[PDB]
């Protein structure tokens, strides 16, 4: 290998989260006061590393934190039931943990906390958060096997009810890229509706990585997914491999989906930094 | 390995099963007379065995016995076009039989009835079986490979049409175990809605058992997963591992079927029986 | 092995398609003025293969064609946003290129074409092709690798809205195949809704080819698939494996898609001809 690998985790790590209300109405996470994004920050950790999240809530409603995938007790499970939400104006240290994988007493394999997940409210409008997801509650996480290939950069698309990142229709998002870049997707999946996301001149393997180790992984390769509320995936693609440059659609390919919006462009760029057919 | 693991199969078995109408007017399957549920029991079996079924109806409605994944020649395929479904009090044998996997003269591999299947009706209400399973009649079934791992345990949660297990919203089921059980889920959507099934605190292996062999299994790891009318998958989980123990929610993550109903609690109890943040 | 498996891929094929609106008001493709057909004819390439295929619209609105999986240049992405559609009664020359898999200069694999593919309009009604598509503009592409498991025969089975390749409700369509004869399904799914794939008697492994190399596959073995719009795969049986000759049923698993069409008959003969329970 040759290209930038993650490393052994294991480390202890601290941050800081709030939930806002926004001034257009939509709640969202930030890493700061005044900084809340919708879909929230990416969290990326190494398996074994363990997350100690000092989270606010700024709202006038109670709030929670909930991830997928990651080893939490139950005090950071995040849902009213057990009492792990936080009151408006109030303060709580959710702690998530991952594990590498490996041989239980009983010669088993234990999993491994790698993959593509996500943390979303649980508690806002209903006990079950679909109030504050539906306003913009969520966000991306990311769990690497020691070994995994890194990219030069990650984006995340959300197919939130008829909205991608709960933006007005036909407004993207947009990501760019040069020909040979490593990028990287993470899309999550909340609201009511299944969709099914598709990208134009790229493919990917269904599996946990969405990349191929070699030529013994039997994997579907796909351009096409079906996704539900609450699914997370991810992947990486080379930008125009084999293709070249140009705006290449992803949208949601249920037909009327991508009628009324839910359509964005992968604009792949040539080093000058055109895009063939595509005018600025 | 030291977990007790599936023996080779290869044995003719016998079991009697009966479809019944129930007070409540749902209609079910049970070995014994006056004993049917909602779902039907659990059937297991070894790769290699063949069951002969000697299944009778008791309803005053024509009933049948389909099988999904196992082996059945045309008179065991349980609908009225092969008029292998049964008349009101009648009786009838069906034979499935399962095979290992192994080499074809031509030098490909033969699959293995291995896997998390189920039956149901095909005939009442339509001939599809829509009444029938509406109103109960659907059970899993489990074909074991040899060396397959054994649970402590195995439950089954069924998602047919806004019920689990054609139950009153809200009420479950509830399982419980206790932490370091190793605890086997079926899972069965029936009916006319696709779904998306959570849990809580733990992950599984999307494969066929659900369980990694060991570390180049690249299946993704995965604590979501959508499925639709007639899907069967199960799997196998350390109940509270790396978690501790907790009332662990697990829900139709598709948010308005997770709030008129739609939820139930895995309760993994420490062995002094208490759940933290749990009242009983 | 001693069963017909690809070759290696590597030649220039060249190809007329032709889009016409037929008769009954359907828009299809064909290799051949007056030959278009809904499905589409299938295209088979070898990984290697570059494909330039003549493309002409003899219908008076515009059209185009769009493949999933292959390789294209923007130039034949065949949407009305790169200009890459085409006038009524215009011509376009697309090109389709497909790789083989292998080791990129940083050491990480790059997957490979292969699989289970479709082709489709992009721009008929809509610019995402919703009248297109809905009136028979789609058809299967099948990239095979070197060393696959070639068929006796491949049937297309198409799930577009609530019909079954575009025919009325319990028109079939219907399949014939003699016990042992190798059979290849490409399964495509277009228009608004979700679906399940169901069939008798029979079951495939959830991976590109739908059959397993050996037993260090860990795939899902299934006889039911959730489909979602412009999904493909394509699976591999032997018609009547462990189970004889029968009229097999395949329908939409979901129960009200069965109850008004939406099922068909993969016929399995003996070497006479016959199949026990059904009559001609
Ligand atoms: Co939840
Ligand atoms: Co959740
Ligand atoms: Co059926
Ligand atoms: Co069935
Ligand atoms: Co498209
Ligand atoms: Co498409």
New binding site residues.
């Given amino acids: 290998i040759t290209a930038r690998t993650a490393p052994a985790g294991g480390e202890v790590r601290h941050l800081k989260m709030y939930a806002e209300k926004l001034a257009d109405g939509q709640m969202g996470y930030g890493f700061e006061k005044g900084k809340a994004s919708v879909p929230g920050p990416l969290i990326e950790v190494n398996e074994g590393d363990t997350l100690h999240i000092e989270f606010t809530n700024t709202m006038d409603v109670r709030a929670s934190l ?1 991830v997928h995938g990651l080893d939490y007790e139950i005090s950071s499970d995040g ?1 009213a039931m057990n009492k792990s939400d936080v009151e408006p104006g109030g303060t709580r240290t959710y702690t998530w943990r991952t594990h590498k994988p490996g041989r239980r007493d009983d010669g088993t394999w234990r999993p491994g906390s790698a993959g593509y997940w996500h943390y979303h409210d ?1 508690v806002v409008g209903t006990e ?1 958060g679909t109030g504050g997801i539906r306003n913009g509650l969520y966000g991306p996480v990311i769990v690497r096997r020691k070994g995994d290939v890194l990219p030069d950069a990650t984006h995340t698309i959300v197919f939130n009810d008829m909205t991608i990142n709960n933006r007005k229709p036909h407004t993207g998002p947009d990501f760019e890229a040069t020909v040979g870049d490593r990028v990287e997707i993470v899309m999550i999946t909340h609201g009511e509706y299944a969709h099914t996301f598709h990208m134009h001149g790229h493919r990917w393997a269904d599996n946990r990585t969405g990349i191929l180790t070699g030529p013994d992984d039997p994997s579907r390769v796909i351009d096409n997914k079906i996704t539900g509320p609450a699914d997370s995936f991810g992947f990486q693609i080379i930008a125009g491999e084999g293709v070249g440059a140009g705006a290449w659609m992803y949208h949601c390919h249920v037909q009327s989906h991508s009628d009324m919006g839910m359509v964005g462009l992968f604009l792949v760029k040539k080093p000058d930094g055109t895009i063939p057919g595509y005018a600025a």
């Fill in positions: 909930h849902t649980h079950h």
